[model samples]
Structure formats: C-alpha cells, structure tokens
Target chain A: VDKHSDEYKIRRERNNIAVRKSRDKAKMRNLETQHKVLELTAENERLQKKVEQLSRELSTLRNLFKQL
Target chain B: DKHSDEYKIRRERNNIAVRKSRDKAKMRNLETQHKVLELTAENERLQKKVEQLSRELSTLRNLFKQL
Candidate 1:
C-alpha cells in the first residue's frame, strides 16, 4: 500500500520542484556577482594606470627643474 | 519505500548546496564593493597629487625662465 501511494508521489514531486527553483535562484545570483566583480576589476585597473602615468609625468617635470 | 528515502536524501543535499551558493554570492558582492571603495579612494588621492604637482611644475618653469 505504501509503495504505490499517490499522495506520497505528489509530495515528492513538489519537493523536487522546490529544489529546482531554489537552485535556479542561487545560480542567477552567482552570475550577478561574477559580473559585478569583473566590472569593478576593470575600473580598478583603469584607475591604476592613470595614477602611474601621472607619476611618470611628475618625475619628468622634477628632472627638468633639477637641470636648471 | 527505498526510492522515496533516496529522493529525500537527495533533496536534503540539494537544499544545503542552495544555501552555500547563496551565501557565497553574498560574500563575493561584499568583497567587490570593498575593492571598489578602496580603489576609488586611491584614485582620488592620486588625482589630487597630480594637480598639485602640475601647479608646482608651472611655478618652477616660470622661475627658471626668469633666471
């Protein structure tokens, strides 16, 4: 009687659907974080390069003053 | 009966994985925000330094021209 119970199978299928929904939501959130990290890293690199360029220019100007 | 027990065990494992995935995503978002803040502050500081240096360079160049 328990092996072929319709109520048990229906409940099991509902549980399966819940698990699938939860998994999908988590996956979507992970993707969002991954995209944000990529953007932030790119912005960080751009700002880093700008700082380096400015430092070089400042050094060149200092050298010009020393030569005078 | 055995198949139902197996499904229950699988469902429990899936629930744990979902929890882990959500928590990891949250942590990663916070980390990215921290990095953005730190980088933004550093960029502002460097920009100020560059402006100051440019002003000083202009003053010195003018002084050298007078000498």
Candidate 2:
C-alpha cells in the first residue's frame, strides 16, 4: 500500500487541519486575554471611585468641625 | 500464521508510532490552550488599564477646563 497517497490528499488535509487549529487557538487566546484585562481595569476604576467618595466626606467633616 | 515473528514486530512498531504521534498532537493542543489562557489574562489587565487611564485623563481635562 502506498501511504504517500497518490493525490497527497491525506497529507494536505492534515496540514490544513493543523494550521486551522493553530490559528483558531491563537485567536481564542487573544480574546481571552483582552477580557481579563478589561475586568481588572473596571475593578480598578471602582476602587478609585470609592477613594474619591471617602475624600469628599472627609472634607465635609472637616468643615463642620472647624465651624464648632 | 500465529507464529509469524515479522508480523508481530510490524504490528508492534506501528502501534508505537501511532501512540507517539497521538501524544505529540495532544501536547500541542494543550500548549495552545495554555497560550490562549495566558493571553486572555494579559488582555484583561490591559483593558482595565486603558479604561482607568481614559477616566483619569477625563478628570484632568475637567480640571483644566475649570481653570
């Protein structure tokens, strides 16, 4: 039996499968990383907002204390 | 026949070759998955930074406008 495949069809199919899978995996990885980065960024924003709120309250308290 | 040494050896060799190839392909797939996961994590971090920076920039612009 000639495993070479007269048409080389098997070899060509294997190569295509390998390339397609590789590209798809790469794209998936990129998207996943993008998602993770966005989530972290949002969390950071939430924390920053909390700090700003606290500072505002502190300033208000200081004004009240000074009046007394 | 049942005692054909060449036939047994050939079968053993083919089996080994097939198993080795299967293992190699499996590892490749696993590595690709790992790469995807790593990128996903990094991308998430970058996205957060982009958003934070944008907000910070906005705040600075507002301050300048007030000035």
Candidate 3:
C-alpha cells in the first residue's frame, strides 16, 4: 500500500501545487526588484554627474566674482 | 480515512509547512520593496541637489556679470 496508495498521491499533489505557485510569484517579485535596481542606479549616476558639473560652474563663477 | 487520526496528523503538518512557505515568500518580497524605497529616496535627493547647484550658479553668474 505504501507504494501504490491514493491517499499518499492525493495529499502530496496538493502540497506540490501550493509550493509551485508560490515559487512562480517569488520569481516575478525578484524580476521587478532587479529591474528597478538597474533603473534607479542609472538615474542616480546621471544626477550625480549633473551635480558635479554644476558645482564646477558655481565655483568658477565665485572665483571670477572674487577677483573682481 | 479522512477522519482517521493518522490522516489528521499528516494534514496538520502539511498545513504548517504551507504557512512557512508563504511566510518566506512575503519576507523576501518585503526586503526587495524596502530596497527599492531606499533607492528611490536617494535618487530624489540627488536630483534636488543638482537643482540647487544649478540655481546657485545662475545667481553667481548674474552677480559677476553685473560687477
């Protein structure tokens, strides 16, 4: 009976399905997280560069003003 | 079979495992969400800084030209 029982198969299948569906949802969440990371990192770097350039411009203007 | 003690015990254990699986999934999802929130806030701050610097440079240039 252990090798060919309906109770064993039925119960195991029910549990199997629940775990698989959860795994599918987990994959989707992970996918969104990775994509957001890439997008945010790129945006962060672009803004950082803009700040650096703007800082340099401000410094140059201050120096000229002081000389005068 | 459904009302047997053995079947009841087996189902009870399965229920526990199922809940555990769901709990793990939510924990992982929450962590990712938290990371995204932090990054979004950081990006917003950086953008504001850029705007501030630009505004400062513009005023300084105007003053220098006037002098």
Candidate 4:
C-alpha cells in the first residue's frame, strides 16, 4: 500500500472498522451480563418466597389436623 | 524503511487477535446465558412443588372442617 493510494485508504478504513467492532462487542457483553444477572436474581428471590409461603400453609394445615 | 511482506505479516497478526477476542466473548456470553436457563428450570420445579403442596393443604383443611 502506497501513501494516499486507493488501496491504502481502503485498508486503513477497514482496519478502523474492525477495531471499532471489537470494542463494541466487548461493551455489549458487559451490558448483557448485567441484564441477565438481574433476571436470575429476581427469579431466585421469587421462588424462595413462594416456597416459604407453601411450607407455611402446610404447617398451619397440619396443626389443625392434630387438634382435631 | 519497511518491506511489503512485513505489512502483510503485521496485519495478519492483528486479524488473528481480533478473531480470538471475538470468540472468547461469544463463549463468555454463552456460559452466562446457560446459567440463566438452569436457574429458570429450577424455578419451574419449585413452582410445581408449590402447586402440589397447595392442593394437599387444601384437602386437609376441607377434611378438618368436615370432622
């Protein structure tokens, strides 16, 4: 590639694009990880709460059975 | 001060490095996404158990009232 030649400019421009793309991909990965983390945490918390409620109901029901 | 083949060699190195980085990021994303699915499946199992427990409790309550 020669200075200011057509092939030289094209190659330089493409190199910039490739560099920019790699940077963008890294940033996207971080964003996705953050969002996914939120989803899993919320799901886990809800499930734990529901499980607790069901066990509590069962305990109350068992108490009535014993009293009878 | 440089040869033409040298430029090709240098560009080749950068290209390979970019590809390596991209592949690593994709692998990282896949691992993270897989974890979410695993947790979601566990949540489903817990929900099923919740339903099962609800029905059992309801039956006992009804029986207690009858007795």
Best by DockQ: 3
Mind giving the per-residue lDDT tens digits that candidate 1 earns over A14-67?
999999999899787767766766776676677667667766765776676565
lDDT string for model 3 (B38-61, tens) is 889999999889888878888877
lDDT score of residue A13 within candidate 1: 91
Query: Residue-wise lDDT of candidate 2 within B1-67, one digit each (tens)?
Result: 7569998998899999999998996676676566556655655675565566557656755665676
Of 3 and 4, the candidate ahead on lDDT is 3
- The DockQ of predicted model 3 stands at 0.51
Q: Tens digits of per-residue lDDT for model 4 on A1-68?
A: 57779988899999999999998997887788768778877977887898899889879777754652
Candidate 4 residues lying further than 4 Å off, grouped into runs, are A1-37, A63-68, B1-3
Query: Which wins on lDDT, candidate 1 or candidate 4?
Result: 4
For candidate 3, list the clashing residue pairs, or say none. none
Task: Pick out the ten consecutive residues of candidate 3 chain B with the lowest summed lDDT.
Answer: B58-67
lDDT of each: 0.74, 0.68, 0.86, 0.83
lDDT (10s digit) by residue, model 4, range B1-67: 3569988899899999999998997888777877878877887887788788878878888888888
Ordering by TM-score: 4, 3, 1, 2
Model 4: colliding residue pairs: none
* Superior by TM-score: candidate 3 or candidate 4: 4
Give the poorly placed runs of model 1, Cα more than 4 Å off: A1-68, B1-5
